[PDB]
Structure formats: structure tokens, C-alpha cells
Paper text:
HOIL-1 shows poor E2-Ub discharge activity in the absence of an allosteric activator or with 5 µM of most di-Ub species, but its activity is strongly enhanced in the presence of M1- or K63-linked di-Ub. In the absence of allosteric Ub, we observe no stable binding of the UbcH7(C86K)-Ub conjugate to the HOIL-1 helix-RBR module. However, the UbcH7(C86K)-Ub conjugate binds tightly when HOIL-1 is preincubated with the allosteric activator M1 di-Ub (KD = 0.2–0.5 µM, n = 2), whereas preincubation with K48 di-Ub, which does not activate HOIL-1 in the E2-Ub discharge assay, enhances E2-Ub binding to a lesser extent (KD = 5.3 µM). We copurified the HOIL-1(C460A)/UbcH7(C86K)-Ub/M1-linked di-Ub complex for crystallisation via size-exclusion chromatography. The HOIL-1 structure contains two near identical complexes (Cα RMSD 0.396 Å) in the crystallographic asymmetric unit. Both complexes consist of the HOIL-1 RBR and the UbcH7-Ub conjugate but show clear electron density for only an additional mono-Ub, rather than the M1-linked di-Ub. Unlike canonical RING domains and all other RBRs, HOIL-1 features an extended loop between the seventh and eight zinc coordinating residues (RING1 Zn2+-loop II) that consists of eight residues in HOIL-1, but only 2-4 residues in all other RBRs and two residues in canonical RING domains. The comparison of the HOIL-1 RING1/E2 sub-complex with the structure of an active RNF4-RING E2-Ub complex shows that the extended loop would prevent formation of the closed E2-Ub conjugate by clashing with Ub in that conformation, therefore blocking Ub discharge from the E2 via the classic RING mechanism and forcing reaction via transthiolation. HOIL-1 I358 is central to the allosteric Ub binding site and, accordingly, the HOIL-1 I358R mutant is less strongly activated by M1-linked di-Ub (EC50 = 24 µM) compared to WT HOIL-1 (2 µM).
Numbering used by the authors:
A (entry chain C): 2 to 153
B (entry chain E): 1 to 76
C (entry chain G): 1 to 75
D (entry chain A): 257 to 510
The structure:
Amino acid sequence: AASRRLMKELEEIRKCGMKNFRNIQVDEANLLTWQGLIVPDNPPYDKGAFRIEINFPAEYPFKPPKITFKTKIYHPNIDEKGQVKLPVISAENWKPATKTDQVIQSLIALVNDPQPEHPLRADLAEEYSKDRKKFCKNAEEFTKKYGEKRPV
Amino acid sequence: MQIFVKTLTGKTITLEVEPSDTIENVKAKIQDKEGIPPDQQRLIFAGKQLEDGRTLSDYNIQKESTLHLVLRLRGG
Amino acid sequence: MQIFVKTLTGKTITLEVEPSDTIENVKAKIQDKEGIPPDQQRLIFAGKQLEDGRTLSDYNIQKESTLHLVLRLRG
Amino acid sequence: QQEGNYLQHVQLDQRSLVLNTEPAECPVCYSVLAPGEAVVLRECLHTFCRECLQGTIRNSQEAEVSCPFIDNTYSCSGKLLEREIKALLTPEDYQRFLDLGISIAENRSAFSYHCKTPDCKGWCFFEDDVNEFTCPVCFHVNCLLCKAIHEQMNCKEYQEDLALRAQNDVAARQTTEMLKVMLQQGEAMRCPQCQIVVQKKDGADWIRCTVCHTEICWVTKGPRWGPGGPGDTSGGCRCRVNGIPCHPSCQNCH
Ligand SMILES: [Zn+2]
Ligand SMILES: [Zn+2]
Ligand SMILES: [Zn+2]
Ligand SMILES: [Zn+2]
Ligand SMILES: [Zn+2]
Ligand SMILES: [Zn+2]
Ligand SMILES: [Zn+2]
């Protein structure tokens, strides 16, 4: 069941495109593991891409998949271990109708505008809530230093 | 052979297994009798966490032995 | 409307009720069909203990729904 | 004419599964379905297929199977009716769905005693002066004082027999010492409601017990909320109240 849907999802993903999710490394061996490249649009992340790995469970789509960031980012919702707390794919908010592209665009929207109400780094969340300027500067520096390069 | 599995507070399960049954199979039998998915299960017998891949005979689990179930919950 | 009442023993009863029927009324029907006093009765629907005073419509209990009967022992 | 058009909806209340009149796509598996091959939920009028609804009930640990529909804009909050759930599952799968709701309510209550007979599904509620519970499933006299079934012997004898039986049970003492070490070192904790032993794997600083649905604050090692559940700040760690975190190390426990 999981192989049947995931097969059809990638077919349409490569049919249209996303312009914000490039390098769709999907090995046909293990269909339960995708590798992609998030390209944000708004600052302080407009100067770099981020490698991510999405792991789909065996009970997909009846259970949520989970995304881990390969490229480390100075973000209040993403810890330095790579985890991201996305409400769309939480075990309590997950709905089998949620499509993979919706998850990708929700994560991209979380990156473009962080939300310090459900953070993984409380200090970065407080800094984002209070001093937006210094947080944006530090995030731009981190994206330039440790971030990837945007594919064109 | 029959063994005991203490799960919920006060509930005791009895599983029909064999010494060649792997830990993954035993966790699956618990799911059929409790609905707890194996990824949320970790079994402890005589002070040792049973690792996946191994069998019940590897831990010297004999008949009428009592395993203990603890839940590994994922944070968010 | 008709609903089901499962007792842990395995027995399932069918009660003719209405969404305006209170939990006390349902317990009274259970007493009339089983002899179990209402003070020793506890009804459970979808993982929630049904409180007296409220109605079946308050818990979104529709027809052919299955409540569960558990015994409250008095000391 | 409209008196018959509005009359056709009492007709749908007869059968449990309201099937689809016009063909529709199931938004979970992408399978074209003919009239009579798709199922339409009643509380949201969303159309799905045979298996996808069956899989949603299987991989759901909530006592209320929610509708699995979400799109570009909103998230559906409809529920599956038990008549629809029963007519979708086998008698074995349907009975497992009923036992899930009973288990959640039993462990949510702080006055629930289960039968000590292995594999038995019988339990009850107790007060504070009750001393015995004749199980209605296996007809075994559960003793409530020492919390175990001991027939043809008194409590003083059962306590003595349990001591002798445990005096040389090295495997029992080992797993007990492991649990004691796991709680002291903070590797695991007992769920503050149903008292089951739980451990946090990855994530932030909060977990939801899959047995009684109680939200647990991992850092403070206790209930996240009060007796009222999520939102109740009369108890629990009261995190984020007035901006103060519940513990200096806490970063997110809801
Ligand atoms: Zn489907
Ligand atoms: Zn719906
Ligand atoms: Zn019993
Ligand atoms: Zn006793
Ligand atoms: Zn619990
Ligand atoms: Zn807390
Ligand atoms: Zn906190």
C-alpha cells in the first residue's frame, strides 16, 4: 500500500515540479527514503539551499513520514541535531490525505517564516520574537558559512 | 511454549511462542493482543533489554517466564 | 433510535432511546433490563466516562452506537 | 416534488454505509471508483474507497477515527460513525476497535482495577472500602487489598507464599533493579496517570502516553496539564505561563 501511493506521488512530482525542491534524489531501491534540496525564497535564508532526508514509514500514508535536515541551520524550529518540529506531520495532526508536496511546501513555509510558539531551540525562538534584526543577521551569516548553494 | 508479558498496569498477557522466535516476532504477537506497535515497544527480561534480531533462546527465556514491557514514546 | 450496550461479559443489549435521553434514563433502562442498580453502573463511549445529567446528543451518541457497561462497586 | 426530494434523505439513514452516487476519486489512494464502489462519510460528505477507510481505522490509536481529508486550504474535522466503522471492519478488527476505547477509559481513570488472570479483559471500578471483585469474565475472586488473586488462602498466607516464591527469583529482582535504576538516572519514568513505564526517544521535551493519552512533561518528570487535560493550567508544570518556562532546561513541552 505504501509502495503504491509513493510510486504515484513521485510520478506527478516529476511531472509538474516545485521550483523550491530540487535534486530529488529518490533511489528506486528503497522507496521509503527520499533526499531533496530546499531552496528558500525570503531572507534570512534566501542565500542558500538545505539538504533534507524524508523517511516514509511502512504504514504510509496512514502514518506520518518524518524529515531530517542534513544541512545544519540557525533556526528556532530546527535543532542542531537535524530534527524539525512540523505540526503537519505530527503523530496527532497527521491525516492520510496529506500529500508529500504539501509537506514539502509546509516545511518551506516554516523555514521562510519561523514560528517561536512550537520551537526546538527556545533561545533562538526568544531571539526571533524579541530581536528580529540580530536573529536575521546571525541566520544570514550561518546560511552563508555552513549553508549549501542554490541550484539554478 | 507459554510465557508471560506484563504490559499495562495490572494486565498480564500470555503468548504462545517458541525458543526460535525472534524478538521482532514476540513484539508482533503483543501487538495482536494489545495494539501497541512494535516500534513503541521495548522488552526487558531479568534486567536486560531484548535487542531485535536475537531470539528468545539467546536470552535463555524458558517456559512460564515473565517479560516486562516498557513504552518508547517519540517526542514532538 | 436504537443503540447497543456491551457488558464486559460479552452480552450486547439493544435499547430504544432518543438523543434527548439523559444518561440517568439510559441507566434506568439498563436496570429495567438487567437488574443492575444505576449507582453501580458506569457507561463508556469512545474512551470517555459518560456523566449523569448530560444526554446522548451531548456526547454525539447516534443510533447503533455501542456503549460499554462497567461495574462500580460500593464499599 | 421537493417533499419527495427532502424525503430521500431519511432513506439514507437506513443502511450504514452511504455509498457514492456519482463517480469520485479517493484522495488517499488515487483510484477511480464507480457508483457503489466508493464510501461517503456522513459528518463531512467526503468520498473515499474500500481499503483507505479500513487502513485509517487500523493505524489510528484514537477512540474516535477522524476523517482522513486535507487539502490546500482546510483540514476536515469530521468523524467516522461506528455504523460506518463496523460495516468497514471484520468482526475481529471491529472488536479490536471497541477494546481500544475501553482501554483508554480504564487507564484514564484512577479507580480502575483489572483482573489479574492472564489474558482476561474483565475490570471494574472500586471505592475505598471494597475488598473483593468477582470477575464477570472468568469467575475468579480478585482480592483488592493485596491486589492479586489468591483462592483457598488468606492474605497472610498469600503474602508469605509470594515472599518464598520471590526469595529465590533472581530474574524478578534483576528486572526490578533495572527499573529502579532507570527512574533514578532519569532514563525512564512512570506515566503519572496509568503508571506505565515510558521512555522518551528523540523529539523535544514532551510525550503523549499511547495508553491513556496523558501528556507528560519530560523535563519536570510529571503531568504536563492538570486534571482537565490539554489547556488546564490548574495543575501540571504550567509551562509558558507568564512567559516562564517550567524548567530552565525546557525548550518545548506544549
Ligand atoms: Zn483509497
Ligand atoms: Zn471529512
Ligand atoms: Zn477475570
Ligand atoms: Zn488478599
Ligand atoms: Zn499513561
Ligand atoms: Zn513542562
Ligand atoms: Zn516546559
